[PDB]
Design a protein around this ligand. Structure first.
Ligand SMILES: Nc1nc2c(ncn2[C@@H]2O[C@H](COP(=O)(O)OP(=O)(O)OP(=O)(O)O)C[C@H]2O)c(=O)[nH]1
Ligand SMILES: Nc1nc2c(ncn2[C@@H]2O[C@H](COP(=O)(O)OP(=O)(O)OP(=O)(O)O)C[C@H]2O)c(=O)[nH]1
Ligand SMILES: [Mg+2]
Ligand SMILES: [Mg+2]
Ligand SMILES: [Mg+2]
Ligand SMILES: [Mg+2]
Ligand SMILES: [Mg+2]
Ligand SMILES: [Mg+2]
Lengths: 293, 293
């Protein structure tokens, strides 16, 4: 939905912006690489349009520059250039660009390229989500966890076994990214993952359910025990001295909602997630850094 | 590597062909849709270039026509048209095209579009393969296996062929998870998968049917022979020295039910699953680590 337009020429940049902004998308402008880098760290950009003819140096500078500024680590870059020669397309790909427009760009070429970049990102994402384990944390991904939730709920319901579920979410994680950078944000996510993996019984099933959201099943554990064990981890996390890029100490916290225990009057695993999500929201709404059950 | 070029104009078709054929790819030519359909059924085509201005009918006829002629059921179609209006790009996508060139095509935009179409084909293929597979084991998932059971059963009834089915289930796997952790549980699931994939004839069809349940079809195999082959693997699994997180040795086993062989008095593939499940229960009830047939 969000498109970054990098182009020195004010009239050409505003014309590209109008075309993006007209055809349903949100346009974001940069006149130099300087202001561009601010915008990739600042907002979550879905696609990049890049003038391959900028102030200083060609774009074996630029393309590689844009890619490692990216908080997520990869991003579709569409090249905008007057280089018509087939040779120049290859160098752009080998440099790590996604696509290519010969200027003067037509409304049609521009829409086509953006649609293609977004289709590939979406397919790339659907594929990464079929993986069992999240690469950065080693925890279960969402789709696998959803199959394990359905299975453990069916099993616990048939066997009149206890099953407690927690949904936790880092408190104001965007401010950690904005203030200290995405690399420090990664360290904070992996530190929470480490605490989650080292604190619960082997029997607990731990998922990275979203960017900074974690779902934990506690088979044979009632809501009161699950709450106290999760609250001890919440407490240990609030006391972690994290170090910034420049060695400043900062703290983070998470909020958590716990649902289930006795499943006798919970008809489905979706109802269990609904209750954990409601308790999460109540935790988020009542001062954060707490557990609601 | 192989690109189909559909274009009436002989001069334009040969020019597109030269550009494809020059830049490392193989060019395959069609002057009408008739010749085109012969080429998609005949050879394995990686990408389609399509003239949206052909002899007969518009191109919401053409695009949907090319798609379902495909033996694989999908193909990346790049549109080649004089329709420069933004509106016309959307119609092409909603019709099911992959990409779009405004004629007269430049060598550069043609190569760019083909590169894009090949990245999408590659992701589309990897995804179709995850959709029939259990990602953790590389075996068929349950959804595929139910359809493949129905097909092999109907095939074996047409040919009066033998078809034996085994349903296996890991013995006290919950205690393995609770004692050793879900990571170790997953390694146990993959280790069983490895044994199942390395032990049977090529023609055997192996599925992960559920969390810790696997269904194996043995086409042209009687119950007694399937039982021997399965019991040898049951025995090999019982001997595997699995290692915990802290290098503690443990063993697992599975129980098995074998059904079928002669299908003459089994009216449907469900009756086959029922009998394998009954014999599984008898295996589980009589001390586990055994096969009942
Ligand atoms: N560093 C980093 N940041 C990530 C990652 N995945 C997602 N994020 C970022 O985390 C943020 C998501 O947090 P939000 O859901 O906005 O809420 P929040 O900022 O934590 O606020 P709240 O207190 O309501 O939870 C923005 C998103 O880009 C990741 O892998 N690494
Ligand atoms: N690691 C892991 N374990 C799984 C997975 N799916 C299921 N499980 C485990 O399977 C367990 C099934 O337990 P039960 O149905 O009581 O059967 P069992 O414990 O295997 O005992 P039985 O011998 O009667 O089959 C629950 C869960 O711990 C999975 O994908 N990974
Ligand atoms: Mg410029
Ligand atoms: Mg969140
Ligand atoms: Mg948050
Ligand atoms: Mg023509
Ligand atoms: Mg079972
Ligand atoms: Mg079992």
């Amino acid at each position: 939905r969000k498109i970054l337009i990098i182009e020195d020429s004010e009239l050409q940049r505003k014309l590209l912006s109008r075309w993006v902004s007209k055809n349903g998308y949100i346009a974001i402008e940069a006149e130099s690489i300087s202001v561009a880098r601010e915008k990739i760290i600042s907002e979550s950009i879905d696609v990049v349009l890049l003038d391959w003819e900028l102030p200083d140096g060609n774009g074996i500078d630029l393309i590689s520059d844009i890619l490692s500024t990216s908080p997520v680590g990869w991003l579709p870059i569409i090249m905008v250039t007057g280089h018509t020669e087939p040779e120049y397309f290859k160098i752009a790909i080998e440099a790590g660009a996604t696509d290519y427009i010969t200027k003067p760009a037509k409304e049609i070429e521009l829409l086509a390229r953006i649609f293609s970049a977004l289709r590939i990102k979406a397919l790339h994402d659907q594929l990464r989500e079929t993986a069992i384990r999240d690469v950065m944390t080693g925890l279960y991904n969402r789709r696998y966890m959803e199959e394990r939730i359905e299975q453990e709920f069916q099993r616990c319901k048939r066997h009149d076994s206890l099953l407690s579920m927690a949904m936790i979410d880092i408190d104001k994680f965007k401010n950690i990214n904005d203030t200290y950078g995405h690399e420090i944000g990664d360290q904070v996510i992996k530190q929470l993952a480490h605490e989650l993996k080292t604190s619960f019984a082997k029997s607990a099933i731990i998922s990275r359910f979203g960017g900074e959201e974690f779902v934990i099943l506690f088979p044979e554990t009632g809501v009161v025990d699950a709450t106290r064990i999760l609250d001890r981890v919440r407490e240990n996390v609030s006391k972690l001295e994290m170090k910034s890029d420049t060695d400043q100490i900062f703290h983070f916290t998470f909020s958590g909602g716990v649902a289930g225990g006795d499943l006798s009057d919970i008809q489905s695993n979706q109802e269990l997630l609904k209750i954990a999500d409601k308790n999460l929201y109540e935790a988020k709404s009542s001062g954060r850094n707490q557990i609601i059950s």
